[PDB]
């Protein structure tokens, strides 16, 4: 249970408030990758989508996750964006 | 035949006397009268590190502008001698005004300022600047900047004998771990290695975590060496595929033997230990004996990870049936078995608690009268006659198990740093046959005295105590023991401590003229001072082993052969002994009778398992002790 | 060592793409070419080097 010392578990990108501010709709793939770093996961299937997730599980505190989704057309320009802050 | 360094000379060097300078170089002209191994063989390549040592030494005393003017090495005409002259210019020593950090701080301004802080007016030091550079590098690594650009540019204010230090730092791009790989765990399951990590794959890199992975793998003890390589992923700017390179080794011993004329008969016995059984990480240990007068057996299994959180689970089985003189009907016949189940979980990275329940069965028959056992039985309300041996006793007892272990050993099987503490304690469950509590404290402290970790001073101690909870007393069958390979070298196994005192009694199953103790058949008619050990309730054992390098064995045996001098002291005594009734016997109440022994200890991690070779003198015994100077164990 | 276990490997089968879906592009690093099966299999094979 929570009482035992599990090590801190980190997952996904280190997405943070400052860098997500630079993202602008319609921006090209290379610059968004530069702004947030390379995506640590991407939609492997037909839809050209990038998934950024910032996830943390400290020793006993509850899991916290911030998920950001980026979609691009056939030419790699950001078409739609959404940023789930929690849960 | 080749030339030898006949003189080392340095011109100038007004700040420090030449002898002091040459006290540090590897190249050396003369042999101290108490040393022989100081070879004077000059080599051209060897001098480079020496010159760098001079560089660093002068940089570490404030002489910033220090430089080598030139170096000339010349032969004698006969080719028998080399003179080495190093020509230097010192200049003045300079003190640091302050450190200015510039560039891309990556938002960690406070911590980087803290690392580079200095007290005012301190002398310039090359070691200080190198330490700051490396510290800032690892500080940036801790937050996921694997490869930060760091540059230290000192600015000399020669006008006032002062120096201003300019540091330029650029963190770069944070690095994420893409794919952790293990190379070399040919037998151990990949899970067994990866469970120890603290850097989870697909997360921002961490120098501290990836290093702690190596640290925990090395503590696990299943590998000879472990190497880490933060190889950058090709074709990507900020992804690194950490690789752990390992090399497995044997993880147990398989001891087997058969009886000879030194034994009651030709029969088999064995003892087996295994820490990584079939590479799954399970720990297994078995002991087995089928002597004509003893059928002792023991087994233990432990899973270090019952769940991935770290909760360890294990248990122990043991069985015993012993007879003293014969098989079918014998004196001091005892039968015993028990079951222990253990659960343990880590409370932090280094401390782990343990818990569990123990069950023990005990039976005794034809017991030889003696003071301690009958005192205990008097405690329990049994009233067995002393004059007659034809009596028996039985017990069924359950115990609560707990313990505490602190482990900071740097390596599993030949540790050189840190210490290990192990506190184990038992208490009887209420309503059980026995009402006693027992606690034992073990401590092993390793400290190196030389930076190479070949000279290590091992401070190892064990402690123990126990007492009855109610009016009863703790059971004789479970007492402490000392002596043997483990606790104290020199003495025979389980021999140290208070000594049994038999009563005069009629002997059962008697046979004329056989060796017997204190039988009215033989005419013995008084209380007995004897040489049969009985153990005791409390003990304290200490050791200081001076580990030393293997002197004349090649490096191939470096990680297998260890030798050490040692000094041993240890004691076992009974707090409950009533000295008033036994004026004519040693007073076991006082622990003042410390045993001591000293000797040489050799450890060899042979392919079949660790070998313990011990030779020692029990240079302070007490009456009734038995010892053999050289003792061996596997 | 050298056991016939590798003959017990289960037969291979491609994953079918659902409607309106494409599976990830397959890496050529681990492709399986196909050729005539007339050659022998297992211990029936003359593992000895060719003679002259």
């Amino acid at each position: 249970e929570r009482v035992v010392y599990r090590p801190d578990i980190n997952q996904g990108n280190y997405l943070t408030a400052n860098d997500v501010s630079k993202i602008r709709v319609g921006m090209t793939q290379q610059q968004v990758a530069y702004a947030l770093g390379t995506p640590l996961m991407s939609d492997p299937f037909g839809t050209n989508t990038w998934f950024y997730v910032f996830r943390q599980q400290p020793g006993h505190e509850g899991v916290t996750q911030q998920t950001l989704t980026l979609t691009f057309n056939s030419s790699g320009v950001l078409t739609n964006i959404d940023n789930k802050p929690a849960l | 035949v080749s030339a030898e360094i006949q003189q080392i000379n340095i011109v100038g060097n007004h700040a420090f006397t030449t002898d002091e300078l040459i006290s540090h170089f590897q190249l050396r002209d003369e042999v101290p009268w108490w040393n022989v191994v100081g070879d004077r063989k000059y080599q051209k390549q060897k001098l480079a590190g020496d010159l760098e040592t001079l560089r660093s030494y002068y940089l570490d005393r404030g002489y910033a502008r220090f430089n080598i003017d030139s170096t000339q090495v010349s032969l004698t005409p006969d080719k028998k001698g080399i003179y080495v002259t190093v020509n230097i210019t010192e200049g003045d020593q300079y003190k640091l005004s302050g450190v200015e950090v510039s560039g891309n701080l990556a938002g960690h301004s406070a911590e980087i300022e803290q690392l580079t802080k200095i007290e005012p007016g301190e002398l310039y030091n090359g070691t200080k600047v190198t330490k700051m550079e490396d510290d800032i590098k690892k500080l940036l690594g801790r937050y996921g900047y694997a490869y930060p650009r760091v540059q230290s540019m000192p600015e000399i204010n020669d006008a006032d004998k002062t120096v201003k230090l300019r540091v330029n730092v650029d963190a770069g791009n944070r690095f994420y771990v893409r794919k952790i790989r293990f190379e070399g765990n040919d037998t151990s399951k990949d899970a067994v290695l990866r469970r120890e990590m603290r850097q989870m794959e697909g997360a921002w890199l961490g120098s501290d975590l990836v290093d702690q992975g190596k640290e925990r793998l090395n503590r696990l003890g299943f590998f000879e060496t472990v190497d880490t390589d933060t190889q950058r992923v090709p074709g990507s700017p900020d992804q690194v595929d950490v690789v752990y390179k390992v090399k497995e080794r044997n993880t147990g011993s398989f001891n087997f033997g058969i009886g000879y004329g030194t034994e009651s008969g030709v029969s088999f016995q064995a003892g087996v230990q295994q820490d990584n059984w079939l590479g799954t990480g399970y720990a297994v240990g078995i002991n087995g004996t089928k002597n004509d007068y003893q059928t002792y057996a023991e087994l233990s299994v432990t899973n270090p990870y019952f769940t991935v959180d770290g909760v360890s689970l294990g248990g122990r089985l043991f069985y015993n049936d012993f007879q003293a003189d014969d098989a079918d009907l014998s004196d001091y016949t005892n039968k015993s078995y028990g079951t222990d189940v253990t659960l343990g979980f880590p409370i932090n990275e280094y401390n782990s608690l343990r818990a569990g329940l123990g069950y023990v069965h005990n039976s005794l028959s034809n017991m030889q009268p003696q003071v301690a056992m009958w005192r205990y039985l008097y405690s329990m309300g049994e009233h067995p006659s002393t004059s007659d041996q034809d009596n028996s006793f039985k017990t069924d007892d359950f115990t609560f198990n707990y313990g505490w272990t602190y482990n900071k050993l740097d390596r599993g099987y030949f540790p050189t740093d840190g210490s290990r503490v192990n506190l184990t304690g038992k208490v009887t469950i209420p309503g059980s046959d026995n009402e006693y509590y027992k606690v034992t404290l073990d401590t092993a402290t390793y400290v190196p005295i030389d930076d190479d970790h070949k000279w290590v001073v091992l401070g190892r101690t064990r402690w123990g105590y126990g007492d009855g909870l109610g009016g009863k007393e703790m059971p004789f069958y479970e007492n402490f023991y000392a002596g043997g390979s483990s606790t104290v070298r020199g003495f025979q196994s389980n021999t140290i401590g208070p000594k049994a005192v038999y009563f005069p009694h009629q002997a059962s199953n008697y046979d004329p003229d056989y060796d017997y103790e204190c039988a009215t058949q033989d005419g013995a008619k008084d209380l007995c001072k004897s040489d049969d050990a009985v153990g005791g309730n409390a003990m304290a054992v200490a050791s200081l082993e001076f580990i030393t390098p293997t002197p004349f064995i090649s490096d191939k045996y470096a990680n297998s052969v260890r030798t050490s001098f040692f000094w041993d002291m240890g004691t076992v005594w009974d707090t409950n002994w009533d000295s008033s009734q036994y004026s004519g016997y040693p007073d076991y109440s006082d622990p003042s009778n410390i045993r001591m022994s000293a000797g040489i200890a050799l450890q060899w991690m042979s392919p079949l398992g660790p070998l313990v070779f011990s030779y020692a003198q029990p240079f302070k015994k007490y009456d009734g002790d038995k010892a053999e100077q050289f003792q061996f164990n596997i | 060592s050298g056991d016939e276990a590798y003959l017990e490997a289960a037969p291979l089968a491609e994953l079918h793409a659902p409607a309106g879906m494409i599976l990830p592009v397959t890496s050529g690093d681990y492709a399986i070419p196909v050729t005539n099966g007339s050659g022998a299999v297992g211990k029936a094979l003359d593992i000895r080097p060719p003679a002259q």
Binding site: - | Q6, V11, G81 | -
Partner: protein, 346 residues
């Protein structure tokens, strides 16, 4: 490698030890050009320990003694002229000592170690150093005028070519195997020529007579050079480090293998060769009574005739042996062994 045994030598005369005096602790295992010198029937001597003494040439009695120390590390000969004694050291210091009282007239820090014998000519005292800065010092006060850089090979020989003066040009060797000539006016370079052959090619003290210079590399070529042009006229393959003598029309030397030879002044043709002393580390020769005296590392003074080169006398004088060259002047032959003792021969 094996070294030659002592030769059986029937002596034509019985040379004798006139006197000897202990001086400090000797040089011992160290290697240096520290040797005594004679001026106006007074013998000046020195030792690595730092003791410097003046000895009466005939009686052998001390007149004064002083120590400049602490490993003073005196080195590089003991030269005397005009009433002053110049003594180098393997530390930067080079001392100039008044002959009468023995107090330090002046001391100067010359760049690098001062191994070479100091030589004094027209008021300037030359010193050749292990780092190549051939420096010059005023006899009067000791201030430097000029310095000249001669390149340093990676591997050298613990010895530096003491210069010689002729017609205002000081000829000096170099560790790089380039004999050089310099004017003492300000140290302006005059000419320089390589004398080595295709490793260590260090040079030693040269000598000049009748306008033709002589140079001698450790390996490669023995040669003569024109003083005014520096062009090489003739050459021979007799490399060595020891000093060599010029007399009449003959050249007496010791090779690097301790084989003793005599050569013509013109063309360098061999007159005779003596090889019995092979591999017996030999001191530089010195002319005495129409014969050459050479000490060895086993304490023997070997006397050899000019005409044939066969030995004429052979006597033990010390157990430690003579590394430093003997000196001959004013009809007295002087030598000091590795041990701290000067022996006067007669």
């Amino acid at each position: 490698v094996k070294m030659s045994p002592l030769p059986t030598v029937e002596n034509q005369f019985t040379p004798t030890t006139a006197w000897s005096t202990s001086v400090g602790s000797g040089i011992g295992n160290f290697y240096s050009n520290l040797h005594p010198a004679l001026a106006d029937n007074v013998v000046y001597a020195a030792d690595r320990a730092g003791l410097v003494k003046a000895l009466n040439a005939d009686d052998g009695k001390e007149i004064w003694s002083v120590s400049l120390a602490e490993p003073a590390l005196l080195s590089g000969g003991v030269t005397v002229s005009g009433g002053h004694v110049y003594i180098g050291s393997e530390k930067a210091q080079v001392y100039a000592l008044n002959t009468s009282d023995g107090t330090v007239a002046w001391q100067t820090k010359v760049a690098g170690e001062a191994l070479s014998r100091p030589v004094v000519s027209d008021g300037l005292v030359l010193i050749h150093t292990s780092n190549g800065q051939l420096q010059a010092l005023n006899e009067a006060d000791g201030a430097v005028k000029w310095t000249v850089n001669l390149d340093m090979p990676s591997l050298s020989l613990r010895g530096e070519s003491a210069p010689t003066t002729a017609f205002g040009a000081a000829v000096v060797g170099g560790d790089n195997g380039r004999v050089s000539a310099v004017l003492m006016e300000q140290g302006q370079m005059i000419w320089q020529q390589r004398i080595s052959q295709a490793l260590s090619d260090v040079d030693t003290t040269p000598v000049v007579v009748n306008g033709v210079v002589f140079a001698l590399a450790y390996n490669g070529n023995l040669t003569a050079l024109d003083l005014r042009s520096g062009q090489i006229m003739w050459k021979r393959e007799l490399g060595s480090v020891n000093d060599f003598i010029v007399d009449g029309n003959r050249i007496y030397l010791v090779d690097q293998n301790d084989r003793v030879m005599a050569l013509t002044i013109d063309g360098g043709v061999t007159l005779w060769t003596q090889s019995d002393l092979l591999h017996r580390l030999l001191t530089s020769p010195v002319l005495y009574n129409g014969n050459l005296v050479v000490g060895d590392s086993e304490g023997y003074l070997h006397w050899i005739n000019v005409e044939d080169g066969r030995f004429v006398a052979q006597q033990k004088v010390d157990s430690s042996g003579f590394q430093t060259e003997p000196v001959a002047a004013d009809g007295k032959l002087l030598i000091q062994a590795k041990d701290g003792t000067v022996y006067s021969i007669t």
